[PDB]
Amino acid sequence: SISSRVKSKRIQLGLNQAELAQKVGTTQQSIEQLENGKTKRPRFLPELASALGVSVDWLLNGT
């Protein structure tokens, strides 16, 4: 699940949504909606992908 990943990987890294947002250079609010799974094709997909350290494909589907 999109949301599942985006929360749990953050938890895994030990970053809150706040530090994650900052590393990504977005804001916690975007990360909040994203965590809830509101975004599908976000402009900052690869940024999230890098900051988490997961594939685009994993974040899309799960690979």
Short mmCIF file of C-alpha atoms in Angstrom, two decimals:
data_model
loop_
_atom_site.label_atom_id
_atom_site.label_comp_id
_atom_site.label_asym_id
_atom_site.label_seq_id
_atom_site.Cartn_x
_atom_site.Cartn_y
_atom_site.Cartn_z
CA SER A 1 0.00 0.00 0.00
CA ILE A 2 1.26 3.50 -0.87
CA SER A 3 0.59 5.03 2.54
CA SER A 4 1.90 1.94 4.36
CA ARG A 5 5.26 2.30 2.65
CA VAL A 6 5.56 6.03 3.03
CA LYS A 7 4.91 5.91 6.78
CA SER A 8 6.70 2.67 7.63
CA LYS A 9 9.91 3.43 5.73
CA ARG A 10 10.07 6.78 7.51
CA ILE A 11 9.62 4.96 10.81
CA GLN A 12 12.33 2.50 9.69
CA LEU A 13 14.73 5.40 9.00
CA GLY A 14 13.69 7.00 12.33
CA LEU A 15 12.87 10.34 10.69
CA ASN A 16 9.50 11.88 11.48
CA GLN A 17 7.47 13.35 8.68
CA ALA A 18 9.20 16.64 9.69
CA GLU A 19 12.86 15.73 9.11
CA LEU A 20 11.86 13.64 6.10
CA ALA A 21 10.08 16.68 4.60
CA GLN A 22 13.15 18.83 5.24
CA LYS A 23 15.56 16.32 3.61
CA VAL A 24 13.18 16.11 0.63
CA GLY A 25 13.00 19.93 0.64
CA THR A 26 9.20 19.76 0.76
CA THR A 27 7.08 20.52 3.87
CA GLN A 28 5.57 18.27 6.55
CA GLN A 29 2.06 19.10 5.31
CA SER A 30 2.73 17.64 1.84
CA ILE A 31 4.31 14.63 3.60
CA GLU A 32 1.14 14.35 5.80
CA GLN A 33 -1.25 14.14 2.85
CA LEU A 34 1.25 11.88 1.06
CA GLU A 35 1.51 9.55 4.09
CA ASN A 36 -2.31 9.37 4.07
CA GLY A 37 -1.85 8.43 0.37
CA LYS A 38 -3.43 11.51 -1.26
CA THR A 39 -0.65 11.87 -3.86
CA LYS A 40 0.01 9.26 -6.63
CA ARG A 41 2.15 11.10 -9.23
CA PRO A 42 3.81 13.78 -7.02
CA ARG A 43 6.41 16.04 -8.66
CA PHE A 44 8.76 15.14 -5.76
CA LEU A 45 8.51 11.35 -6.30
CA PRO A 46 12.29 10.86 -6.90
CA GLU A 47 13.09 13.24 -4.01
CA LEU A 48 10.98 11.12 -1.64
CA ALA A 49 12.54 8.04 -3.27
CA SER A 50 16.08 9.30 -2.56
CA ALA A 51 15.40 10.57 0.98
CA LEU A 52 13.72 7.28 1.94
CA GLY A 53 16.26 5.35 -0.18
CA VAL A 54 13.73 3.26 -2.16
CA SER A 55 12.98 2.84 -5.88
CA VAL A 56 10.48 4.98 -7.76
CA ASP A 57 8.94 1.60 -8.69
CA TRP A 58 8.70 0.52 -5.02
CA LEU A 59 7.00 3.82 -4.15
CA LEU A 60 4.69 3.49 -7.16
CA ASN A 61 3.82 -0.19 -6.63
CA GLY A 62 6.29 -2.08 -4.41
CA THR A 63 9.30 -3.82 -6.00
#
